[PDB]
Design an enzyme around this catalytic site. Structure first.
Site, PDB file in Angstrom:
ATOM      1  N   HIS A  40       7.752  80.350 120.220  1.00 53.84           N
ATOM      2  CA  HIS A  40       8.323  79.458 121.199  1.00 53.84           C
ATOM      3  C   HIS A  40       9.725  79.097 120.742  1.00 53.84           C
ATOM      4  O   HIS A  40       9.952  78.840 119.557  1.00 53.84           O
ATOM      5  CB  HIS A  40       7.445  78.192 121.314  1.00 53.84           C
ATOM      6  N   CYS A  74       4.989  46.895 141.699  1.00 55.61           N
ATOM      7  CA  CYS A  74       3.717  46.373 141.250  1.00 55.61           C
ATOM      8  C   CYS A  74       2.744  47.512 140.896  1.00 55.61           C
ATOM      9  O   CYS A  74       3.061  48.688 141.019  1.00 55.61           O
ATOM     10  CB  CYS A  74       3.100  45.493 142.341  1.00 55.61           C
ATOM     11  N   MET A  75       1.560  47.155 140.426  1.00 49.96           N
ATOM     12  CA  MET A  75       0.567  48.157 140.086  1.00 49.96           C
ATOM     13  C   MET A  75       0.185  49.028 141.281  1.00 49.96           C
ATOM     14  O   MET A  75       0.112  50.235 141.154  1.00 49.96           O
ATOM     15  CB  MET A  75      -0.669  47.491 139.494  1.00 49.96           C
ATOM     16  N   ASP A  76       0.060  48.425 142.453  1.00 48.98           N
ATOM     17  CA  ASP A  76      -0.432  49.132 143.633  1.00 48.98           C
ATOM     18  C   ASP A  76       0.450  49.044 144.886  1.00 48.98           C
ATOM     19  O   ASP A  76       0.142  49.650 145.920  1.00 48.98           O
ATOM     20  CB  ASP A  76      -1.786  48.519 143.956  1.00 48.98           C
ATOM     21  N   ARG A  96       7.523  74.037 113.843  1.00 49.32           N
ATOM     22  CA  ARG A  96       6.494  73.049 114.078  1.00 49.32           C
ATOM     23  C   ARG A  96       5.155  73.710 113.742  1.00 49.32           C
ATOM     24  O   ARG A  96       4.672  73.620 112.625  1.00 49.32           O
ATOM     25  CB  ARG A  96       6.493  72.545 115.516  1.00 49.32           C
ATOM     26  N   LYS A 107      -0.782  74.437 132.047  1.00 53.25           N
ATOM     27  CA  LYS A 107      -1.209  73.353 131.181  1.00 53.25           C
ATOM     28  C   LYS A 107      -0.853  72.010 131.855  1.00 53.25           C
ATOM     29  O   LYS A 107      -0.099  71.980 132.849  1.00 53.25           O
ATOM     30  CB  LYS A 107      -0.544  73.472 129.822  1.00 53.25           C
TER      31      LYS A 107
END
Ligand code: NA
Ligand code: NA
Lengths: 379, 364
Positions: free
Chosen positions: A167, A308-310, A137, A38
């Site tokens: 679970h 930073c972003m990049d 749950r 998953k």
């Protein structure tokens, strides 16, 4: 094998993933190993890991969503696939069409799912019933309702009671909850005929207990080489192999003289060199990583300014230059760049660190001498 | 249009993106608005934003990486595209094959790049005007870099630019750097494109010397900071909603309450630290309780809530308790990152006036 044009990528070691899977096969030789892929196999890539695991004997996978299931199906995975979430009732025909088993979280869900079964899809609808035994749950809590759902499944020839599972909520930590759920599970499952698959264990559960009663296990993060908690890691002596590296190649360096500074968001006291990395928070290397250390040509270097972003900036030794490889996440548990140390830096757990790894990062798979690349931007 | 099979998704409002674009166009009437669609248009899906913006006057786009530029090319985007990041020599030819302008960060880089040339090469020179953000610092080297472009008919000096470091805050730094920028530019031939402003610079200054602008975050309806928001009149329309529907409810005992289980979690970008937040379940503010899981989130809810009800996790309003900035604070980060965190697992549902279109990267 896709092309990539930025030296920032994840190395995914498929041999490590196959070793981890065997460790689980070996620990539970009488059970079906339901490989959990998953969330795109925790960031590594569902398809490539699933193909690979099939080549190594995996016959059953678990995903979170039907989208994840159809994705494996559209790319040649033919093993059994179980969806762990709750499918919108409308989509029941697509699960049938694609040979995907489904989780029955409640009687209401099953009743609504049947109503959406047009007759266009006539293959079997495989169902695994989820039981709630502890921190409740999702799942059925009382045995009566459980028998009623089984009883409903038995009215339609098209619906098969293929499994029942639960679970554990605290298996990665000390306590009697897990053993209390285990007994609650058997008590529920014994009051009705047993289906093929009976599964209750995740990574923690599989590494810590045998659970003879549950004939299938659902190892997750441990397949990828990570302990689900420090407690488990210090508890068992099984060895798991980390499977991921996050790497970036320096693209530029600048030497700051004492008095000079750079503003990414840093003033140098002595002569210092700075290296520019083409990776940033949009790749999943979050802002909170500022002040962490990374590995450059063997040496620990400090991440400075802000991420930073990049781009990311690192204080490095003078000899470092464009092209040098930087290991931001290494494949060893006792590493200042381990997934765990990074998670600690992000104030989170190892699962989320891998999950944050964005689509802008290609996955480069290693199998012995073989190399192959997936770059989502160009797919 | 793609299908999707989990009730969790993003609403991306392209009409909001087009308006924000026109606000910048209107604010700088005679400039080129180089739309920043880097990082998959800050999480909105760059292919659809670029295509939508080209239908509204966008003629130039800026991305962070060549893979991002090529991705746009593969999908029909024909406009100009500049890679703001530094591309090492190796891959230059592919920037030439695909018609993508590149950034010259230094003379080393240019000289070197004049070796993977084996079709015009469009270059925008980057100048460091005071804060350091790597780039050419001196006019000499600046003049030397151009002369070098002039030696090759295949190399084109299309633009020069700089990045202000603190346009989101008060001070003379921006102005002082704006001046250095001019001083350097006015000492050599001027290229067709001169640009120096990001969202901030664009919302706060006029900069008539710079003939192009680079708005990014604000194209999508977000102010780059509160200080900019509290200083400008311009109204921005947030373009993103993050939605999930309740899959099941359960009532607890010992205060007794009802909890709602949502099919969304940290693998989708709704991080673990969101525990303690509030979401909007039919106008009711409900708290996110327990641990946020990889695939599920649990919310404390009134007993009147039911399976199928829509939950707003990120709302398209700034004033809201589910605004991108409130979520940002909860995540101890900035709005930009909240958007980038949103995973490939989430379908993007684009709205363009009752025209709906889906992108599900998993089935794509
Ligand atoms: Na049946
Ligand atoms: Na030239």
């Amino acid at each position: 094998s896709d092309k990539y044009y930025r030296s920032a990528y994840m190395n995914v070691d498929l041999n490590a993933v196959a070793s981890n899977f065997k460790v689980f096969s070996t620990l539970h030789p009488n059970k079906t190993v339901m490989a959990v892929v998953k969330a795109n196999a925790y960031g590594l890539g569902s398809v490539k890991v699933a193909r690979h695991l099939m080549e190594n004997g995996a016959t059953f996978f678990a995903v979170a969503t039907l989208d994840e299931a159809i994705e494996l199906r559209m790319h040649g995975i033919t093993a059994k696939i179980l969806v762990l979430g709750v499918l919108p009732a409308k989509d029941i025909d697509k699960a049938i069409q694609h040979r995907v088993a489904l989780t029955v979280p409640s009687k209401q869900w099953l009743k609504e799912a049947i109503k959406n079964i047009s007759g266009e899809q006539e293959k079997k609808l495989w169902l695994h019933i989820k039981l709630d035994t502890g921190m409740g749950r999702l799942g059925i809590k009382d045995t009566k309702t459980y028998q009623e759902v089984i009883e409903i499944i038995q009215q339609y020839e098209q619906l098969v009671f293929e499994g029942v599972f639960t679970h554990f909520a605290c298996a990665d930590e000390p306590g009697d909850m897990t053993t209390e759920q285990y007994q609650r599970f058997k008590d529920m499952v014994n009051e009705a005929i047993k289906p093929e698959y009976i599964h209750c264990q995740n990574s923690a559960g599989s590494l810590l207990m045998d659970c003879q009663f549950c004939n299938a296990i659902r190892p997750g993060i441990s397949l990828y080489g990570y302990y689900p908690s420090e407690y488990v890691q210090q508890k068992v002596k099984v060895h798991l192999k980390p499977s991921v590296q996050l790497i970036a190649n320096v693209v530029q360096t600048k030497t700051l003289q004492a008095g000079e500074s750079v503003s990414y968001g840093y003033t140098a006291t002595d002569p210092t060199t700075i290296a520019l990395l083409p990776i940033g928070y949009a790749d999943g290397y979050l802002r909170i990583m500022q002040g962490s250390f990374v590995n450059v040509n063997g040496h620990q270097c400090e991440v400075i300014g802000r991420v930073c972003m990049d781009q990311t900036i690192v204080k490095v030794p003078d000899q470092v230059k464009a092209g040098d490889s930087v290991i931001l996440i290494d494949n060893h548990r006792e590493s200042p760049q381990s997934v765990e140390v990074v998670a600690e830096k992000q104030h989170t757990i190892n699962y989320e660190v891998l999950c944050n790894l964005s689509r802008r990062l290609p996955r480069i798979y290693h199998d012995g001498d073989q190399r192959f690349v997936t770059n989502e931007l160009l797919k």
